[PDB]
Symmetry: C3
Subunit: 143 residues, 3 copies
């Protein structure tokens, strides 16, 4: 499976990119003193710090959007890598996803004007939709 190393490289970079979002979220909570739990707020200055914050909420939305998109790619890309795609075509699917997703997180956390985030989201979903349909046909025909 000549496409497998490319898949594993892109996927693992995206997982690390999600870990970076978790790290950023934690740092933002600490810096803004905005905690979700009274036990956390009390350790960090008092009950008034058990509160929501727009920058924390933004981080959580970026992380959730990652879960909505990167997790399915992990499944789809892995299966697709084993079904014998042209390696260059596979590379292009994986690269468009990687670049689109990294750009999405930059656009989201960086508060870039619309529709920059929505374009990057849509661009990244294209190779996912492609892989899903290709897998669907391969599965269907082996039933």
């Amino acid at each position: 499976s000549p496409a497998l190393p490319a898949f594993l490289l892109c996927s693992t970079l995206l997982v690390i990119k999600m870990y970076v979002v978790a790290i950023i979220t934690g740092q933002v909570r600490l810096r803004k003193k905005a905690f979700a739990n009274p036990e956390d707020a009390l350790r960090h200055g008092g009950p008034q710090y058990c509160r929501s914050d727009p920058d924390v909420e933004r981080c959580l939305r970026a992380h959730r959007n990652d879960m909505e998109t990167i997790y399915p790619f992990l499944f789809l890309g892995f299966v697709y890598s084993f079904l014998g795609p042209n390696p260059f075509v596979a590379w292009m699917h994986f690269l468009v996803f990687l670049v689109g997703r990294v750009a999405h997180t930059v656009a989201y956390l960086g508060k870039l004007r619309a529709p920059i985030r929505s374009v990057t989201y849509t661009l990244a979903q294209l190779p996912c939709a492609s892989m899903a349909l290709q897998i669907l046909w391969e599965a269907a025909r082996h039933l």
Copy 2:
């Protein structure tokens, strides 16, 4: 692995079903003018459209519930497909999950009376619980 094509067909349909929920959510935000981000609200009419909406919130709950259930199935069903189950028994596990999950999303977004959604949820979790236990025993015995 005679169960693998059936697994891949059901799983990929469920992923596409999750993409449809993402699409619906976006359309609902646009139609109700209810955006989570000031950059989005400003592109679409002004800051007063940076607001929550019950139909948007409902879409997000359906999508989150999908992530809580479909993602584990993707892992469990894949592993289970390789452990040599009777193919018909495997088919039944996958079909009950697929039908239960599609019904769950229809019940959720369609605002069907309780306990229709909760029944479909519980029904779909049954084959997941079954596969998890079967995998647990197979793993345990190879330790």
Copy 3:
């Protein structure tokens, strides 16, 4: 792959642990009469029970944090199991994750003082970060 049974045992226990969190959340909603949907509230006593609750919110945060961490482990641990790690070293990665994650959920739902939850979270992420980097290098070198 001598590490595979250990991976599948730990992963499947963690999935079951996530199902337990879903079950607890449902029980808490019912016990506190705090539902997210008017159709649910109406079946269970009236519209005033369509409301948020801190214990329900806490359960949802624990479940979300599981999705943020356990799902990537399912991918990373599976790939890592096939790359020929020393089986004892692999066992240690999987065990630290399993124990850290179970402890995280106990700390979260049990409202244990800070920084108990954050320590368990960080400890569990260590083997995940390790596996991710090891996979990154293996993938990179096969490009």
